[PDB]
């Protein structure tokens, strides 16, 4: 998709069964919880298009899943059956969806609506991890505010009442740093600007105390070779290995399956809740195979994974399953 990302658009949130618009002046900032469609009309090398852009939260339930559908569905309709569809879950958006915002980072934020719940309120002090892709395509995604949370190859924001911080992680690039400043223009809050290591004390109350994180050696790089999620499989009746693309996600790890996490200097061996040993057994034997033609194998277990794992995944959750 060539097109520069800067024609009209609009964006409503799933909320029930209807669609309702989103504050045209918070365009670019998404609830992990809820699920939105994006028409997108543009003007290309001549021609007009329109794009409906369907992107499902991280954290979106099945209902609100079906409503987006009818939805979509609808709207299809209303325009005469003309734009070009697009399904999208988060973390997997295109290049070209990502820039419909001005170069602004995508933020997703804890939380979203329900029709029993309904309007979820901000937490007092709140956590986001800053990540940005290869192609500096960058994500905000709020997470849980504990030492723990943090990872050595991003930027975070921290936002207490009293305070906000703007930790730059050894391996964080400046589009992380940029997007985590275009965070806190958001929150309408000025940073202290923090290098990790030399964190001061107010930053590790803010968390709760300071605790061990997500690091490793490949963390820390500057440099960057980008790690390499594997889906390892037998159900369809034989052993297979397909990768997995696009931002690493926790749903991405299937619980039924052992997955092969590749940080170059490390292979990890995922093993699902509900995996066979087979799949595992393989897995080892096909991991050994990939190093052999060109390094340590951890084996790690659902619900038991060490910070040097978690950390490759953008904004992890110790209650997902
Ligand atoms: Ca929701
Ligand atoms: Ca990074
Ligand atoms: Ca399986």
């Known amino acids: 998709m060539d097109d520069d990302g800067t024609g009209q658009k609009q964006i409503w949130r799933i909320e029930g069964s209807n669609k309702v618009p989103v504050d045209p002046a918070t365009y670019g900032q998404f609830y992990g919880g809820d699920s939105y469609i994006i028409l997108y009309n543009y003007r290309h090398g001549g021609r007009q298009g329109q794009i409906i852009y369907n992107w499902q939260g991280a954290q979106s339930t099945q209902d609100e899943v079906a409503a987006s559908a009818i939805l979509t569905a609808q709207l299809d309709e209303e325009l005469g059956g003309t734009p070009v569809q697009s399904r999208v879950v988060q973390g997997k958006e295109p290049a070209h969806l990502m820039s419909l915002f001005g170069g602004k980072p995508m933020i997703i934020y804890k939380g979203g609506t329900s029709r029993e719940g309904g309007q979820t309120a901000p937490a007092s002090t709140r956590l986001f991890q800053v990540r940005a892709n290869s192609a500096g395509a960058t994500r905000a995604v709020e997470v849980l505010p504990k030492a723990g949370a943090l990872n050595s190859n991003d930027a975070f924001v921290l936002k207490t009442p009293s305070?906000?911080?703007?930790?730059?992680?050894?391996?964080?690039?400046?589009?992380?740093?940029?997007?985590?400043?275009?965070?806190?223009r958001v929150l309408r809050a000025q940073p202290v600007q923090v290098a990790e290591g030399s964190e001061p004390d107010g930053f590790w109350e803010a968390l709760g105390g300071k605790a061990a994180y997500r690091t490793?050696?490949?963390?820390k790089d500057k440099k960057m070779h980008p790690p390499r999620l594997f889906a390892c499989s037998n159900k369809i009746g034989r052993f297979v290995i397909e990768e997995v693309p696009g931002e690493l996600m926790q749903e991405d790890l299937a619980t039924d399956d052992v997955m092969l996490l590749d940080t170059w200097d490390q292979v990890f061996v995922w093993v699902g809740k509900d995996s066979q040993e087979?799949?595992?057994?393989?897995?080892?034997?096909?991991?050994?195979?990939?190093?052999e033609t060109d390094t340590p194998i951890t084996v790690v277990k659902q619900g038991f994974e060490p910070p040097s794992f978690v950390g490759w995944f953008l904004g992890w959750d110790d209650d997902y399953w």
């Open 163 to 184: 305070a906000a911080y703007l930790w730059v992680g050894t391996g964080a690039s400046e589009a992380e740093k940029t997007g985590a400043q275009e965070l806190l």
């Open 278 to 291: 087979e799949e595992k057994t393989e897995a080892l034997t096909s991991a050994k195979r990939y190093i």
């Open 216 to 219: 490793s050696p490949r963390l």
